[PDB]
Design a protein around this ligand. Structure first.
Ligand SMILES: [Zn+2]
Lengths: 210, 52, 210, 49, 49, 345, 47, 48
DNA sequence: GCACAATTTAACACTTTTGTCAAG
DNA sequence: CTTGACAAAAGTGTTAAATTGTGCTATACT
C-alpha cells in the first residue's frame, strides 16, 4: 500500500485495517489441502498410469520379497486400467444414473392402498440433500454447514448403491427393514441373478400328489 | 471326482516371467502359460517358469 | 438382427451417463396426491422416461400411431409405446463430485491401491474429515516440510493458510501492561496474570475503558 | 351394444373350490357396531360348505 | 414385559408435555397418551413369534 | 460417524457473549449498508456487488464454477466488476472493506448460534429426517434469521432465530416427509385433525367417531370430510414387506401386470383384426372403405361425414346412409356365420 | 394355429438386469461375432 | 395423580390408557378378529 | 399457524361443428 | 343420392371458487 512505499517482505495472508491504518500480514503459506471426493478426483485425474507402470516395474525387481509383492499387487490394478482403456476419474461420479420407473414400480392394489420400492425412497432422499446443497453453494453459506451437508450427500449416494456397507442401513422411519439398494438386488440368494436368471417360474406346468 | 480335481490345480504361479509381458507372481491358468511358452519357444525367446 | 456371442463390462463415465439419461430428475417428488400423474420433474415423470399409455402424449393432443416419435409441442412427451419406461433412464447432476462406495470399501479397494492410500486414511479423506495435501506451495509442519499425498487436520490446515493466533482471557478490571498493536515475546507478560506464549503482535479485544 | 360406463367387478369363487352356501354376512359402513376402513362403502362375506 | 417397556415410552411422552405450555394449569388428563402403550401392545399381539 | 461429527465440529467454536453478539449484528449491518452505499457510487445492483464480495471472500473460482451449470459469468459479469469498483477514491474505497468484513461477520454469527439450531431440531425427531438431515434444513432457517435480524430492537438473537428455525423445519417436513407429495396447507390440516383426535380420545376416553371428531373441528366439517382427507393421509406400502411366516417371501412379486398384453389377449385382438377383415370383404367397395374411415381403421384416426363426403365427392348425407346400410348389411352375414358373435365380454 | 414355436430373443429379466447394472454406472455392452455393438433394446434407449 | 413440586397442590383426575385384549375360555385371544394363540417361550434363567 | 399472492379448476355464457330427419 | 332445417354435442371465451405456494412473527432458549 501507500502508493508503492511500504511493502511486505514475507509470504502470508494480508489483512486490511480501517481503524489502525495498517496493512498487516500474517505468516502463512497458501496451500491447497482440499478435503473430499473433489480432491481424490483431482489426484485420480492427474495420475499417470504409464509413469507409475515403468516405475513399478523397476520397483518390483527389488530384492526384498515384501516391497516386490506390494508393487505387484499395485501394478495389477494399474495394468487393468491400461489394457482396458478406462479412466479412473470416472470412479468419482458427477452424474448419478436414475433407474427407469417400471424398474422401480409404484402401483396401487386392491383396497386402494399403494405400494413402492425402497430404491424409490433412496433415489429421493438423495436428491433432497443434493439440492439443498446446490442452494447453499449459491447463497453463500459457511464452510461448516457445507462440509457437513456435502457429507450426507456422499453417504446418501452410497446408500443408493450399497446400503449397509457403511453404518446402520437407512430404513423407512418406524421400521427396522433395511432399504434395498442396487447392490442389494444383484448379490444374495433371492437376488436378480440366482432367482430371476439361473432359475424361474414357468408357463405350461403344474403339480400334484403321486 | 477327477474332473473336479483337475479344475482344482488348473492355475499356476509365475516365477521369472522371462521374455514374456507377465509379472513375477502374476498367477494365471495352466493351458494359458502352456501355450505362451509354446509360442515363445518358436519365437526364440525364453519361456516362463511356474509352480502348480 | 445380429448374433450375440460376447458380453463386455466397463466403467461408465459421467459424460456417458449423461448420454444415457433422457432428463435430470430435479423435484424429489413421486406423483400428485390427487391426479396421481407423475410430477413435473418427478422420478416417474412421463416427459422424460416415457408415456404411461401407449402412443399417447401427456396432454392428449397426439393420440395415435399416426404420429410416431414426434415430440409433443405442448406437454413435451414423445408419442410411443409405454414400454419405453423400462429402458429409459435418468440422471442427477451432483454439485459436488462423489465416489462409488464399491471401489472404496472393496477388499482390495481399487481407488485405494491406485492412489497408494490406505482404506483407513482414504476413508476420512473421502468422507470430509482430514485434509490431504496438493502442491504444498513451500509449506512446513513441525519442522518437517509437508509434501503432497500427506494428510492434515483442521487445525494444522488453517494454521498454515490462516496463520497461528493465541487468545488470552482477561478478568474484568485488569489492564494490559502492553500497548495495543505492540510486539510481544514468548513468556513476556501482557497482564498481571497473562503470559504470552508466542512472539508476535498482540491486539486489544473489546476494551472496557477509554 | 351400448358401452356402459360401469363394468363388472364381481367376485367369482376360485377353481377347485365348490360347494353350498351356509352363510351371508354383509356389513356396510355407517351401520351400528361396525367400523369400516376409510374409503370403503360395504363388505360382503360368504361361507362355503 | 411389553406392557412396561411400552409404558416407559409413555413416561417419556409425559416428561415432554409438562416441561412446557402452562405448568400451572395441567392435569394428567392432558399429560398422558394412548398410542405409546396401545401400539406397544397391538404390536406384540401380532408380530411377535 | 457423521452424527458425532457435526456435533464436534460445532463444538469446536465458542458461542458468543452479549457483547460479541451486539457487535456482530452491528458490523454485519454496517457492511450490508456499506454495499448499499456502493450501489449509489459505481451505479450497480444491490445484490451484484454483494455476491461479488463473496467472490473474493467466500472463495476463488470455486464459488462461481458450481452453482449449477449456470449462475452468472465469472470472468465476464464479475471480473469487470472486480476492477470497476477497484478504481475509486479513498471516500468510496473503505465502504468496500466494510462490505468484506461486514458480510464476513455474518458467518461468525451463524456458526455461533449453530449450537442452538442443532439443539432446537433435537426435539423434532420422528419426522422422517434423521437428525443431521433434519438439523440441516433448520440451519438454513438460521441463515434467514440472521440477515433479517435487528440489534437495535435490544432483543437476544435467540428469540428471533428460534422461530426461523422452527419455520424451516416445519416447512421441510411438509415438503418432504411422506413418499408422495402433499401441498403444504393440506399437510398441516391433517396434523390439525390428528391433533384433535388424540385429544378428544383422551377426554372422552373412548376413541371418537367420524362425526363427533369433525364436530369438535369446527364449521363445515362433517363425518365424510375427515375420513376423506384421512384416506389421503396414509402413505404407500413398502414392496419389501415380507408376507407370511417365512423369511423367503415378499409383497412385491404378489402384484400382477396389467400394463402389458397377455398372449391370450394378443391372439384375441389378432382374431378380431382378422375375422373383421374377411367379414369386411363382403361389402360394397365404397361402403367397405367409408366404413373403415368412420371407425378409424385406416390411419387410426376417425373421419367425420364431412371428410368422407369430400373423399368420394358425395354429401355428408349420403355417407351417413352408406354407414346405415353398411353395418346392417354385415348384420345379416353375422347373424348366420356366428364367427364374430363372440367378443361380447 | 399349429406353426412351430418361433425363436425367442430377450429373456427380459436380463434386459432389466442390464439396466440395473447401468444404474451402478456399469457399462454393459453386448457383442456379436466380431467385437461389435449389438442393440438389445430395439429403438428404446438409443436417444 | 399430577402433583406440583413446589405449590404443594394436589391434582388427581383419573385418565384413560387404551384397549387390552382379553383371553378367552380356551386360552387364545382374538386379534384383528382372528383367533390367535400365544405360544410359550424358553430361555436360560437369570443369575450367576 | 396465518394472511395472501399465485395459479389451478370448475363454472358457465354461448358459438360452431356434427349427427340427424322428412322430402326430393 | 341431395336440400334444408335442427337439436345435440363439442367448442371457445371469460369467471368465480378453490387450492396451493410463501414469507413471517421479537422475552429467552446456544
Ligand atoms: Zn401433447
Amino acid at each position: 500500500a501507500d502508493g508503492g512505499k511500504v511493502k511486505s517482505e514475507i509470504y502470508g495472508r494480508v489483512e486490511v485495517d480501517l481503524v489502525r491504518n495498517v496493512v498487516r500480514v500474517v505468516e502463512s503459506y497458501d496451500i491447497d489441502a482440499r478435503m473430499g471426493a473433489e480432491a481424490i478426483q483431482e489426484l485420480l485425474k492427474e495420475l499417470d498410469l504409464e509413469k507409475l507402470e515403468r516405475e513399478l516395474l523397476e520397483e518390483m525387481k527389488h530384492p526384498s520379497r515384501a516391497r516386490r509383492a506390494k508393487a505387484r499387487k499395485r501394478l495389477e490394478v494399474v495394468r487393468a486400467f491400461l489394457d482396458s482403456g478406462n479412466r479412473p476419474e470416472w470412479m468419482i461420479l458427477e452424474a448419478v444414473p436414475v433407474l427407469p420407473p417400471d424398474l422401480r414400480p409404484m402401483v396401487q392394489v386392491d383396497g386402494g392402498r399403494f405400494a413402492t420400492s425402497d430404491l424409490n425412497d433412496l433415489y429421493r432422499r438423495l436428491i433432497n440433500r443434493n439440492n439443498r446443497l446446490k442452494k447453499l453453494l449459491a447463497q453463500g453459506a459457511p464452510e461448516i454447514i457445507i462440509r457437513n451437508e456435502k457429507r450426507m450427500l456422499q453417504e446418501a449416494v452410497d446408500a443408493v448403491i450399497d446400503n449397509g456397507r457403511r453404518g446402520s442401513p437407512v430404513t423407512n422411519p418406524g421400521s427396522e427393514r433395511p432399504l434395498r439398494s442396487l447392490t442389494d438386488i444383484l448379490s444374495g440368494k433371492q437376488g436378480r441373478f440366482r432367482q430371476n436368471l439361473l432359475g424361474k417360474r414357468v408357463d405350461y406346468s403344474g403339480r400334484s400328489v403321486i | 471326482i477327477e474332473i473336479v480335481v483337475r479344475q482344482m490345480l488348473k492355475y499356476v504361479e509365475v516365477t521369472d516371467p522371462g521374455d514374456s509381458r507377465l509379472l513375477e507372481g502374476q498367477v494365471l491358468e495352466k493351458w494359458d502359460v502352456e501355450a505362451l511358452n509354446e509360442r515363445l519357444i518358436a519365437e526364440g525367446k525364453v519361456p516362463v517358469a511356474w509352480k502348480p | 438382427k445380429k448374433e450375440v456371442r460376447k458380453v463386455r463390462i466397463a466403467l461408465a463415465s459421467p459424460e456417458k451417463i449423461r448420454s444415457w439419461s433422457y432428463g435430470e430428475v430435479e423435484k424429489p417428488e413421486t406423483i400428485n396426491y390427487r391426479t396421481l400423474k407423475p410430477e413435473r420433474d418427478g422420478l416417474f415423470d412421463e416427459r422424460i422416461f416415457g408415456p404411461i399409455k401407449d402412443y399417447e402424449c401427456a396432454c392428449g393432443k397426439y393420440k395415435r400411431q399416426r404420429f410416431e416419435g414426434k415430440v409433443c409441442e405442448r406437454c413435451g412427451v414423445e408419442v410411443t409405446r409405454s414400454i419405453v419406461r423400462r429402458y429409459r433412464m435418468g440422471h442427477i447432476e451432483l454439485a459436488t463430485p462423489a465416489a462409488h462406495i464399491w471401489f472404496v470399501k472393496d477388499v482390495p479397494s481399487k481407488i485405494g491401491t491406485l492412489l497408494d492410500l490406505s482404506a483407513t486414511e482414504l476413508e476420512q479423506v473421502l468422507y470430509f474429515n482430514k485434509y490431504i495435501v496438493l502442491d504444498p506451495k513451500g509449506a512446513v509442519l513441525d519442522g518437517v516440510p509437508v509434501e503432497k499425498r500427506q494428510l492434515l487436520t483442521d487445525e494444522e490446515y488453517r494454521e498454515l493458510r490462516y496463520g497461528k493466533q493465541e487468545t488470552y482471557p482477561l478478568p474484568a478490571g485488569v489492564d494490559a501492561l502492553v500497548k495495543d498493536g505492540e510486539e510481544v515475546v514468548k513468556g513476556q507478560e501482557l497482564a498481571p496474570g497473562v503470559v504470552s506464549r508466542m512472539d508476535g503482535v498482540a491486539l486489544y479485544r473489546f476494551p472496557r475503558r477509554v | 351394444e351400448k358401452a356402459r360406463d360401469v363394468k363388472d367387478t364381481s367376485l367369482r369363487v376360485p377353481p377347485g373350490e365348490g360347494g353350498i352356501v351356509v352363510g351371508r354376512l354383509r356389513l356396510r359402513r355407517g351401520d351400528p357396531g361396525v367400523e369400516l376402513k376409510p374409503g370403503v362403502r360395504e363388505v360382503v362375506r360368504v361361507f362355503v360348505a | 414385559d411389553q406392557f412396561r417397556v411400552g409404558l416407559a415410552r409413555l413416561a417419556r411422552g409425559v416428561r415432554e408435555r409438562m416441561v412446557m405450555g402452562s405448568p400451572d394449569t395441567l392435569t394428567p388428563a392432558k399429560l398422558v397418551n394412548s398410542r405409546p402403550l396401545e401400539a406397544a401392545l397391538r404390536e406384540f399381539f401380532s408380530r411377535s413369534q | 460417524d457423521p452424527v458425532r461429527q457435526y456435533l464436534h465440529e460445532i463444538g469446536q467454536v465458542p458461542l458468543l457473549t452479549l457483547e460479541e453478539e451486539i457487535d456482530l449484528a452491528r458490523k454485519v449491518e454496517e457492511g450490508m449498508e456499506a454495499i448499499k452505499k456502493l450501489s449509489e457510487a459505481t451505479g450497480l445492483d444491490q445484490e451484484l456487488i454483494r455476491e461479488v464480495v463473496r467472490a473474493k471472500i467466500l472463495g476463488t473460482a470455486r464459488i462461481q464454477k458450481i452453482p449449477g451449470l449456470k449462475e452468472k459469468p465469472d470472468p465476464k459479469t464479475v471480473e469487470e466488476v472486480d476492477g470497476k469498483l477497484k478504481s475509486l477514491p479513498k471516500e468510496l474505497k473503505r465502504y468496500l472493506h466494510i462490505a468484506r468484513e461486514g458480510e464476513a461477520a455474518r458467518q461468525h454469527l451463524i456458526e455461533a448460534n449453530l449450537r442452538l439450531v442443532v439443539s432446537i431440531a433435537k426435539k423434532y425427531t420422528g419426522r422422517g429426517l434423521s437428525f443431521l438431515d433434519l438439523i440441516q434444513e433448520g440451519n438454513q432457517g438460521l441463515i434467514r434469521a440472521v440477515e433479517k435480524f435487528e440489534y437495535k430492537r435490544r432483543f437476544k438473537f435467540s428469540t428471533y432465530a428460534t422461530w426461523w428455525i422452527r419455520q424451516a423445519i416445519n416447512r421441510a417436513i411438509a415438503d418432504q416427509a411422506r413418499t408422495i407429495r402433499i401441498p403444504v396447507h393440506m399437510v398441516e390440516t391433517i396434523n390439525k385433525l390428528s391433533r384433535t383426535a388424540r385429544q378428544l380420545q383422551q377426554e372422552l376416553g373412548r376413541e371418537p367417531s367420524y362425526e363427533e371428531i369433525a364436530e369438535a373441528m369446527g364449521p363445515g366439517w362433517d363425518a365424510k370430510r375427515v375420513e376423506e382427507t384421512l384416506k389421503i393421509a396414509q402413505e404407500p406400502v413398502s414392496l419389501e414387506t415380507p408376507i407370511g411366516d417365512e423369511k423367503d417371501s415378499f409383497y412385491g412379486d404378489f402384484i400382477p401386470d396389467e400394463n402389458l398384453p397377455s398372449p391370450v389377449e394378443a391372439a384375441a385382438q389378432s382374431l378380431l383384426s382378422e375375422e373383421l377383415e374377411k367379414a369386411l370383404s363382403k361389402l360394397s367397395e365404397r361402403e367397405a372403405m367409408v366404413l373403415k374411415l368412420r371407425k378409424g381403421l385406416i390411419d387410426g384416426r376417425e373421419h367425420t361425414l364431412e371428410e368422407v363426403g369430400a373423399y368420394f365427392g358425395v354429401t355428408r348425407e349420403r355417407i351417413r346412409q352408406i354407414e346405415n346400410k353398411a353395418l346392417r348389411k354385415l348384420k345379416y352375414h353375422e347373424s348366420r356365420t356366428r364367427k364374430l358373435r363372440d367378443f361380447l365380454e | 394355429k399349429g406353426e412351430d414355436v418361433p425363436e425367442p430373443s430377450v429373456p427380459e429379466s436380463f434386459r432389466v438386469l442390464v439396466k440395473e447394472l447401468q444404474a451402478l454406472a456399469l457399462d454393459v455392452q453386448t457383442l456379436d461375432e466380431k467385437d461389435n455393438p449389438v442393440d438389445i433394446f430395439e429403438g428404446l434407449a438409443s436417444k | 395423580q399430577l402433583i406440583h413440586k413446589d405449590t404443594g397442590l394436589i391434582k388427581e383426575d383419573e385418565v384413560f390408557l387404551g384397549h387390552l385384549p382379553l383371553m378367552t375360555e380356551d386360552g387364545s385371544f382374538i386379534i384383528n378378529g382372528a383367533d390367535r394363540v400365544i405360544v410359550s417361550q424358553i430361555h436360560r434363567s437369570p443369575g450367576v
